[PDB]
């Protein structure tokens, strides 16, 4: 009954109905694996209990990529209808371009040839990775996140060198007019009147290195 140890526990994290209050409890159970073995007993127990999964890679963690999210394994089939609608339309592009970057660097590590279109998505996906790094104890509001994802997948952060993007996405949030984030937080959505405006305010950005 070690499955019942956690399923009795993690089923109490619910979103209640309106007739009971509409209150909610969101859980984050933490499992420590041994050698990246997600096929352990307790790990596969809780994987078949929880809704999603945030898999933190130990080889991404020593290459400086922190939070070391295994984007291929990290899933969450319950938050899709629960993301910020401004982020839902700009990070639908983010996870697919990181998929191609996961396809190129997993076969073209030999240095065989540069197809010069797969070579484009290698240093595009390297820019989306460095855009997704984050320091510790410094959370970002969701509006200042979805502009930094807007600034990168729309190519405004293109030809910035990959060791500048930590300093460059700090340049994006600092220089863009703070009234942009107030419209985006309140609509919850990058409206047609705003992405035409937010594309403008990203062209007026002193990116480092030029």
């Amino acid at each position: 009954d070690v499955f019942y140890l956690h399923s009795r526990l993690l089923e109490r994290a619910a979103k209640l109905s309106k007739e009971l209050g509409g209150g909610s409890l969101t859980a984050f159970p933490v499992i420590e694996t041994q050698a990246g073995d997600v096929s352990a007993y307790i790990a596969t127990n809780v994987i078949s209990i929880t809704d999603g999964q945030i898999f933190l890679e130990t080889e991404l963690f020593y290459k400086g990529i922190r939070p070391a999210l295994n984007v291929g394994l990290s899933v969450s089939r319950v938050g899709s209808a629960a993301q910020f609608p401004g982020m839902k339309q700009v990070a639908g592009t983010l996870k697919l371009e990181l998929a191609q970057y996961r396809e190129v660097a997993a076969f073209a590590q030999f240095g065989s040839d540069l197809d010069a279109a797969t070579q484009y998505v290698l240093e595009r996906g390297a820019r989306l990775t460095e855009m997704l790094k984050q320091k510790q104890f410094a959370p970002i509001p969701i509006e200042r996140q979805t502009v930094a994802v807007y600034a990168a997948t729309k190519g405004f952060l293109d030809k910035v060198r990959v060791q500048d993007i930590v300093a460059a996405e700090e340049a994006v949030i600092s220089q863009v007019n703070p009234a942009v984030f107030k419209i985006l937080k309140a609509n919850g959505k990058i409206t047609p009147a705003l992405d035409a405006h937010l594309k403008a305010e990203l062209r007026k950005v002193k990116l480092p290195g030029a």
Partner: protein, 365 residues
């Protein structure tokens, strides 16, 4: 008699019996609930008989999702027109103590047995995680004062599982088409609770974790899933021959995995690296977008007919499609959509337009 499910790997390599016991094996996030919901969405809506969903030891979120989704589809109607519903839910989910999960599959079985015996008609019994019945008896039997069996299970595993499973049958008075998902612990098929379940099932659908990590969804292992309908006297000659040819290509590719890993692709023979290319084509082609997965994928679901599957896989087997890329086969319906996706992805490498088409610079008011 066959049950066409719309799923390519199921209809080709392990066809389901209309009136038989179907098992979906796999552990912890391989996709045997999305497979059971696609089987509900395809088979149960085009069935005519009644359905019984017995949720044994599963998420309560999933049971509420199925109840609300079945209210929207009219399969479950509320209030005054309730009697025109087509499904009974019996829920013994994973928050229940081990006495309740060990006996809720029997309750759902009884609700199915009444329709089979007394009403005398063909029903569908979807049991999500029949492994939780075995597990709940394994939790109880430590306290009933018994010597434990192998890995830690009860000594009466095979007979408990057998006495439950031998009631889920087609008889002369009715039919029960049983689709049961079976969890495997630690992705080990040699665990006694899946290894005992293997004998009670007509069609086995083994979902593996590595095929899911390759992106191929539904993650059905084609070299570990079987059927008693895969017989040339049941499904025909060309269907059985196409299925055996696909399995021969996949086995010949599985035997080449070590030297491809450690020596490289560049050192096989020409027929070997033709086999590798055709196998990488039919691995992608066995995947399919599901109509119940279109809310978290974005691709529309693709019901494939059985003749479309046989025709497309015969085309890949004979060599009519050695010219297309591999990713033309990834997540498509049938052999027309591989060519549509081929021109859709080879117009994409030519997709470079002039002047960026702005019409945004100083839009007037």
């Amino acid at each position: 008699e066959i049950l066409v499910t719309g799923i390519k790997v199921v209809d080709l390599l392990a066809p389901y019996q209309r009136g038989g016991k179907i098992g979906l094996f796999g552990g912890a996030g391989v996709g045997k609930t999305v497979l059971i919901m696609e089987l509900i969405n395809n088979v149960a809506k085009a069935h005519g008989g009644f359905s019984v969903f017995a949720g044994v030891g599963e998420r309560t979120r999933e049971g509420n999702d199925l109840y609300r989704e079945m209210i929207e589809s009219g399969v479950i109607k509320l209030g005054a027109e309730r009697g025109n519903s087509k499904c009974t839910l019996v829920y013994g989910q994973m928050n229940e103590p081990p006495g309740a999960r060990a006996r809720v599959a029997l309750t759902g079985l009884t609700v199915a047995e009444y329709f089979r015996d007394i009403e005398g008609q063909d029903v569908l019994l979807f049991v999500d995680n029949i492994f939780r019945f075995t597990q709940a008896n394994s939790e109880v039997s430590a306290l009933l004062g018994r010597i434990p069996s192998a890995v830690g299970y009860q000594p009466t595993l095979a007979t408990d599982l057998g006495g439950l499973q031998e009631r889920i049958t087609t008889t002369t008075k009715g039919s029960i088409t049983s689709v049961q998902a079976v969890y495997v612990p630690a992705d080990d098929l040699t665990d006694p609770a899946p290894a005992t379940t293997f004998a009670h099932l007509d069609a086995t659908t083994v979902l593996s974790r590595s095929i899911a990590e390759l992106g191929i969804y539904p993650a059905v292992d084609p070299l570990d899933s079987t059927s008693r309908m895969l017989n040339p006297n049941v499904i025909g000659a060309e269907h059985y021959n196409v299925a055996r040819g696909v399995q021969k290509v996949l086995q010949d590719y599985k035997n080449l995995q070590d030297i491809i890993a450690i020596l490289g692709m560049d050192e096989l023979s020409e027929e070997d690296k033709l086999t590798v290319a055709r196998a990488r084509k039919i691995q992608r082609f066995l995947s399919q977008p599901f109509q119940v997965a279109e809310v978290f994928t974005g691709t529309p679901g693709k019901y494939v007919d059985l003749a479309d599957t046989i025709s497309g896989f015969q085309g890949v087997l004979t060599g009519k499609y050695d010219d297309l890329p591999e990713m033309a086969f990834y997540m498509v319906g049938d052999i027309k959509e591989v060519k549509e996706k081929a021109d859709k992805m080879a117009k994409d490498i030519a997709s470079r337009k002039e002047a960026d088409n702005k019409k945004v610079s100083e839009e007037l008011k």
